[PDB]
Design an enzyme around this catalytic site. Structure first.
Site: not given
Length: 226
Positions: A80, A112, A126, A145
């Site tokens: 990530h 995020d 995300e 997600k």
């Protein structure tokens, strides 16, 4: 790669939008990976990244050659963090710092990205990766997600006036990107190359400390819902 530029590419008129998913298959003539030497110890993971080979595509322009260290406690999410560092203007804001509090258990969810644009649009984004080479894996990460964030954000949107909220998802793999944030092919290719490097680093690190895989597995597991 700039976060405001990316968030400017979506339009939500009223309510909560999940956009349109778009697939970016790997098509550029991709250069080889840079030399990567990985050493794992109690300090963390130390990586020496060589220079990205030259190519007509010029992929790798976002790779910094040199020495970097990741603390071991975060090695689990290398894939990530390395893939999306160009986009991770990380402050880690929770939903309640931009959305009305509901005490539904999700006020503390930390995506995020939460970015408010000058026109008032709220863009929650995300990021995700998968090591699967099958379109189903990309779709699974993207769906996961969507399912994590749609009900909470929709509940918040129902109790706001004039909410214009867009929930973005970008999933990167070796062979393609699946995203409802419009990208250029070059941006998606660069993300894919970054992911290739990240997964090589992670694989090497895991060969010396297998427990990170366990950490990765558990951590994404908890990330399914909180």
């Amino acid at each position: 790669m700039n976060l405001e530029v990316l968030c400017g590419r979506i339009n939500v008129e009223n309510g909560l939008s999940l956009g349109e998913p778009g697939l970016y298959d790997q098509i550029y003539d991709r250069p080889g990976l840079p030399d990567l030497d990985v050493t794992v110890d109690a300090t963390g993971v130390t990586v020496d990244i060589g220079a990205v080979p030259d190519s007509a595509s010029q992929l790798g322009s976002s790779i910094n050659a040199g020495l970097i260290t990741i603390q071991l406690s975060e090695a689990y999410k290398i894939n990530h963090d390395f893939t999306f560092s160009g986009l991770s203007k990380t402050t880690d804001r929770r939903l309640s710092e931009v959305f009305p509090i509901t005490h539904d258990g999700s006020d503390g969810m930390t995506p995020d990205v939460i970015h408010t644009r000058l026109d008032g649009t709220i863009v929650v984004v995300e990021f995700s990766t998968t090591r699967s080479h099958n379109i189903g894996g990309l779709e699974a990460a993207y769906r996961t997600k969507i399912e994590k964030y749609r009900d909470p954000i929709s509940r918040r949107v129902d109790i706001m006036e004039n909410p214009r909220v867009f929930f973005g998802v970008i999933v990167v793999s070796s062979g393609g990107v699946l995203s409802n944030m419009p990208l250029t092919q070059d941006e998606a290719e660069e993300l894919m190359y970054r992911f290739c490097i990240a997964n090589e680093i992670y694989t090497k690190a895991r060969s010396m400390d297998a427990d990170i895989e366990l950490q990765k597995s558990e951590e994404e597991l908890e990330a399914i819902s909180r």
